[PDB]
Design an enzyme around this catalytic site. Structure first.
Site, mmCIF file in Angstrom:
data_model
loop_
_atom_site.group_PDB
_atom_site.id
_atom_site.type_symbol
_atom_site.label_atom_id
_atom_site.label_comp_id
_atom_site.label_asym_id
_atom_site.label_seq_id
_atom_site.Cartn_x
_atom_site.Cartn_y
_atom_site.Cartn_z
ATOM 1 N N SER A 46 0.806 -1.220 0.000
ATOM 2 C CA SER A 46 0.000 0.000 0.000
ATOM 3 C C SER A 46 0.842 1.275 0.000
ATOM 4 O O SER A 46 0.265 2.366 -0.102
ATOM 5 C CB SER A 46 -0.979 0.020 1.192
ATOM 6 O OG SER A 46 -1.830 -1.125 1.208
ATOM 7 N N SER A 184 1.663 3.523 5.704
ATOM 8 C CA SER A 184 2.011 2.176 6.128
ATOM 9 C C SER A 184 1.713 1.165 5.018
ATOM 10 O O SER A 184 0.996 1.445 4.062
ATOM 11 C CB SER A 184 1.244 1.805 7.397
ATOM 12 O OG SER A 184 -0.071 1.428 7.056
ATOM 13 N N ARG A 226 4.275 -1.302 13.383
ATOM 14 C CA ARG A 226 5.047 -0.566 12.376
ATOM 15 C C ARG A 226 5.127 0.927 12.703
ATOM 16 O O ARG A 226 6.199 1.539 12.603
ATOM 17 C CB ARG A 226 4.443 -0.781 10.983
ATOM 18 C CG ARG A 226 4.654 -2.199 10.408
ATOM 19 C CD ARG A 226 3.655 -2.502 9.302
ATOM 20 N NE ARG A 226 2.306 -2.549 9.849
ATOM 21 C CZ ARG A 226 1.198 -2.395 9.137
ATOM 22 N NH1 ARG A 226 1.242 -2.154 7.836
ATOM 23 N NH2 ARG A 226 0.018 -2.479 9.747
HETATM 24 C C1 LIG Z 1 -1.622 -2.400 1.866
HETATM 25 O O1 LIG Z 1 -0.418 -2.544 2.020
HETATM 26 C C2 LIG Z 1 -2.522 -3.449 2.514
HETATM 27 C C3 LIG Z 1 -3.178 -4.281 1.400
HETATM 28 C C4 LIG Z 1 -4.589 -4.849 1.586
HETATM 29 O O2 LIG Z 1 -3.161 -3.460 0.238
HETATM 30 C C5 LIG Z 1 -3.384 -2.736 3.551
HETATM 31 C C6 LIG Z 1 -4.356 -1.712 2.985
HETATM 32 C C7 LIG Z 1 -4.064 -3.689 4.549
HETATM 33 C C8 LIG Z 1 -3.421 -3.299 5.851
HETATM 34 S S1 LIG Z 1 -3.934 -3.910 7.314
HETATM 35 C C9 LIG Z 1 -5.235 -2.844 7.885
HETATM 36 C C10 LIG Z 1 -5.402 -1.582 7.033
HETATM 37 N N1 LIG Z 1 -5.237 -0.398 7.907
HETATM 38 C C11 LIG Z 1 -5.366 -0.862 9.306
HETATM 39 C C12 LIG Z 1 -4.488 -0.086 10.256
HETATM 40 O O3 LIG Z 1 -3.295 0.057 10.014
HETATM 41 N N2 LIG Z 1 -5.063 0.392 11.365
HETATM 42 C C13 LIG Z 1 -4.366 1.269 12.291
HETATM 43 C C14 LIG Z 1 -6.429 0.066 11.750
HETATM 44 C C15 LIG Z 1 -4.947 -2.328 9.288
HETATM 45 C C16 LIG Z 1 -2.467 -2.395 5.644
HETATM 46 C C17 LIG Z 1 -1.562 -1.817 6.617
HETATM 47 O O4 LIG Z 1 -0.816 -0.918 6.199
HETATM 48 O O5 LIG Z 1 -1.546 -2.207 7.802
HETATM 49 N N3 LIG Z 1 -2.432 -2.017 4.377
#
Ligand SMILES: *C(=O)[C@H]([C@@H](C)O)[C@@]1(C)CC(S[C@@H]2CN[C@H](C(=O)N(C)C)C2)=C(C(=O)O)N1
Length: 243
Positions: A46, A184, A226
């Site tokens: 991402s 992230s 992270r």
């Molecule tokens: C991108 O790297 C990844 C995949 C699906 O493209 C993605 C969008 C899933 C997650 S885990 C989830 C998304 N954001 C949440 C978060 O960090 N918080 C604080 C709730 C968890 C990520 C990720 O960067 O963690 N990216």
């Protein structure tokens, strides 16, 4: 110094292979337990959302005001079940919005734009809404760090208003005068799975410290680690002190 020691001792806690790169415009600095990671290419996951937004705004395929409507098919997360601007999807890491964006760009423009800016190995394969999530596109931590550095400076090969718009989509928090921008990433669809925390710190006195965490991820790991590992390092370095 003792700064380095305090920083490394942080990683001496973490049981996952990790490197943390910093770039101030002159010197690369590498920290962590597996320094070699900094030169190794991993899928951007991402973090590619940064370049996807740039290419899309630069090529008149979206605006930072356009609303990407939820099409009623539920998404992996429940928080994704709504309408988003590109800035809103950037902070919620909303993947389907940025897949729609990639499909608006199309494979030909996406390839040539990536060659034009020199992003990673510049490889997308055949599915234009999948290459950053499963490969073949890969990029080193050192490359990610120099990329977001130029973004902060407005020195990427894009129109200055376009970098300004994607820059502020990354804004996380400010402490007094100092600003933190970050994105992230967690590439789960690859073995090993790769974690990213890329971004930069803009001092009030113009100076910029770009940074890239890159670490190996296990199914079930702490999704917050992270960001909290990166802020601890930045505080130990003295780039972005805690309040
Ligand atoms: C991108 O790297 C990844 C995949 C699906 O493209 C993605 C969008 C899933 C997650 S885990 C989830 C998304 N954001 C949440 C978060 O960090 N918080 C604080 C709730 C968890 C990520 C990720 O960067 O963690 N990216």
């Amino acid at each position: 110094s003792i700064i380095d020691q305090n920083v490394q001792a942080l990683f001496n806690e973490i049981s996952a292979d990790a490197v943390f790169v910093t770039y101030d415009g002159q010197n690369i600095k590498k920290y962590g337990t597996h320094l070699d990671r900094a030169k190794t290419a991993y899928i951007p996951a991402s973090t590619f959302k940064i370049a996807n937004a740039l290419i899309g705004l630069e090529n008149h395929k979206a605006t930072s005001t356009e609303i990407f409507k939820w099409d009623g098919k539920p998404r992996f997360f429940k928080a994704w079940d709504k309408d988003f601007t590109l800035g809103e999807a950037m902070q919620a890491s909303t993947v389907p919005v940025y897949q729609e964006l990639a499909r608006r760009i199309g494979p030909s423009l996406m390839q040539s734009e990536l060659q034009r800016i020199g992003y990673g190995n510049m490889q997308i394969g055949t599915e234009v809404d999948q290459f950053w999530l499963k490969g073949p596109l890969t990029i080193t931590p050192i490359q990610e760090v120099k990329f977001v550095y130029d973004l902060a400076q407005g020195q990427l090969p894009f129109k200055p208003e376009v970098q300004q718009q994607v820059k502020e989509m990354l804004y996380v928090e400010r402490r007094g005068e100092n600003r933190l921008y970050a994105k992230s990433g967690w590439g789960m669809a690859v073995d090993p799975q790769v974690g990213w925390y890329v971004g930069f710190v803009e001092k009030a006195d113009g100076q910029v410290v770009a940074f890239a965490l890159n670490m190996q991820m296990k199914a079930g790991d702490d999704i917050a680690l992270r960001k909290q590992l990166s802020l601890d390092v930045l505080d130990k370095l003295g780039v972005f002190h805690y309040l």
